[model samples]
Target: DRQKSSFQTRFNVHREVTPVELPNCNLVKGIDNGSEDLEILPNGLAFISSGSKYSGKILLMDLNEKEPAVSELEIIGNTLDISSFNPWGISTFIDDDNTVYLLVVNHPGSSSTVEVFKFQEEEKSLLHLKTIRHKLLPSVNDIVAVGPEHFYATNDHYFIDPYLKSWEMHLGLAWSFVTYYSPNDVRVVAEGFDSANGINISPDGKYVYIAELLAHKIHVYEKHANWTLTPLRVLSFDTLVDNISVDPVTGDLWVGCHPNGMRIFFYDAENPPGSEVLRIQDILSEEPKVTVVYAENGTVLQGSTVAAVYKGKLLIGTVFHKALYCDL
Candidate 1:
């Protein structure tokens, strides 16, 4: 029988978060008007894509600031209407000249083509330096640079299945595509993804971690000598896994779930004898159901959906939240 290219494997972890005082959370009311892709700045501020309004935008806000008093959500750039393109993913990679590499997605995922821009920092905004297009790769959605020369991205296509996807007059060659893009040539090292979202590098920079959105699992790979990839392990999340970020401080993985109530997953390298963690169903229901599943090397972190973790959280545009913040 033909081997299954990709299949679902559910992993559960038994864990809990010892709480503390609730932190301030704010909702960016009308600005982010779309799904918010967020990143914590080097200084701890939240940098978010304000949106693809007739105008594209980016917002910067300090999360440490108190609400009502913290109305510093500023639009650093407003090139939204430039070619009137929709910016999907946004990330920052500062260069030697102190130039901030602000990455953007010109087209959404599933587009046979994708573009990456090198934005030079101007006084109040940024100037587009050049647009590098990758033809072989589908839409380049989220990106995380591994080094000055390398980066990884997730492809979130809207197509039902790529194996037999046909073209459409309105949207040709529709299918989910994800990949790793090298800035040196803007070429993807890998392709053929089903809702591939977040891409990350191990602390040692020896491996790549990819969260397959629809697959509900994280995949691990050993960086190939030829600069390609070799599959290593898999981390299964009973449900969906969205974007994941590696903690610069701990090298621990932090994943953002799709919010069927905000579930999460993590790996315990220190677990003696090496066992996986799992979720016991209905723990909050008094009657608990359990399952022993596979938690491989790719599983980094998971579970945690609370307003405190997202409020005032980065949205599409602006840092201010109308409902959550009194200042708004």
Candidate 2:
């Protein structure tokens, strides 16, 4: 019974969301399956990952437009197996040469590999680059890219099998970890995470933010020059934080969270999971300002997994529902 109680507390099964409304909100059309993760560039270009278990694809939107329309990014290159492309978490990096590199966490029925792609701005497509997989990256949830091939990833589970992963979560096995990945060298930089979900980097690349989902904590780590992470501070939350998006200029964290976990994992049509977005400012300060930017019941947008902001416009995404684009 102790484990059951722990599960209830960790998942916030009985918690309810206090709805925070905003004006000028609309559901993003053409995004029906799921937008579990997304990343926005300083140029107002956004890449969103859609699909969950057996299917996946990436969608692009130009936030600069007054009314943004979502479009699927065509995947080019023959090296990738398109049929098994199940993307979840995502990140983007812009090289000094102005090349945009996108990295996606591919489940492909849970092989747990991170797929590398090159974004062609003119063609509006993704060129499949490479697939990176290692023993340390068993169940990657999200990633933050440093270069085209270098990144830090968070593993949500220790086991690769779905059955064992559920058991691992229910039993409170804090085996999830964060790892640094490169072509020649890779290592687990952080460990003992309940569920390391999202990874993001600061604009200056000096700090890294990692969301520990089941633990309800966000970890701030100092990024060393050698690609190693040292924990500097830990920020805790009441709800289950999923993915984090950082504002390049202001260095604010826009996070998506679940108010009740039972409705999310249990999949009850009568009682769907509620969506919540949090804005974290001055995160390094002793008294950080954490505000509820948006909160809604499942009737509007269920299972909010990621939220991104651009030019005072907030884009909130769901795990298996429609996305909301609203004014800040």
Candidate 3:
């Protein structure tokens, strides 16, 4: 019964969330389908990927406004097909010329793909640039962009086949990994992960963070000049960490987590999935400050995937529910 025992441990089947309350928290308007993943720019613009499995779209919100609202950013031009635009993980890279490039992980028609787009702030639209498909990037869950055309991505599963992938997880196969991708070169940089879900780079560009969801761990790796990752250390957690948001100025990590993996995957209405956000400060130090900034028992926000901060305001996103905006 080792498989059964490990299954419960990996999935946190019966984990109960310890709720942490915040005073000024409100559910964001117009995000119903799924705000699974999100990223924030230094200038207060947030890009939220709001489509889970079947269909998807990219939403934009300006945090600087008095009362921010989510708007569907129009995908202009026909270079990339929007009909199959199932966006999952999103990362934005701003060029020296202030041209913002968006790299989105898309699963259209149940196949994996990475799409690139240019942000036109004046018109509030995304100009589709290119669609990238590589043999190395299979089942990509999330990505952290190093350049407009370069990034690191996580593959949640080793196999692309649904049946085999499920069996792989059930068998406790830690075959998932992370890949370094670019126009010139592509390669798998790290391996042996139990669902490598989220990826982000340090603000100084000297380190990288990878979230192993089933293992309930966040790995810190040293980034070399050749774009390879060397494992530095690992941080363990009670819940499953999904996406990472790095503060540019402070180098702190804000992570959105699933307190109970069972409710998220099983999908029971009465026992809904819970959400948790952790703020990690001085992570590289001997003793880091790990604080549960917010936690709820799925009554308010279900299945949180990512959380980002902008000028004292925090935005927490869910997998297939609503987003929460709070005052820090």
Candidate 2 lDDT over 145-246, as tens digits, reads 998998999999999998999899889999999999998899999999999998898899999999999889999999999888899999999999999999
Clashes of 1: 25
Q: What TM-score does candidate 2 get on C-alpha atoms?
A: 0.98
Q: Which segments of model 3 are wrong by more than 4 Å?
A: none
Evaluate model 3: give its TM-score: 0.98
lDDT of 1: 0.44
Q: What tens digits encode model 3's per-residue C-alpha lDDT throughout 166-279? A: 899888799998999998999999999999998998888999999999999999999999998999989999999999999999999999999988898889989889899999
- Pitting candidate 1 against candidate 2, the one with the higher TM-score is 2
**Candidate 3 global lDDT:** 0.92
- Ten contiguous residues minimizing lDDT sum, candidate 1: 300-309
lDDT score of residue 307 within candidate 1: 14
What lDDT score belongs to each candidate, Candidate 1 first?
0.44, 0.92, 0.92
Residue 146 of model 3 has an lDDT of: 89
Candidate 3 has its poorest 10 consecutive residues by lDDT at 48-57
lDDT (10s digit) by residue, model 1, range 176-254:
5545666555545555555576676655667777767556666777876456777776776654455555545444455
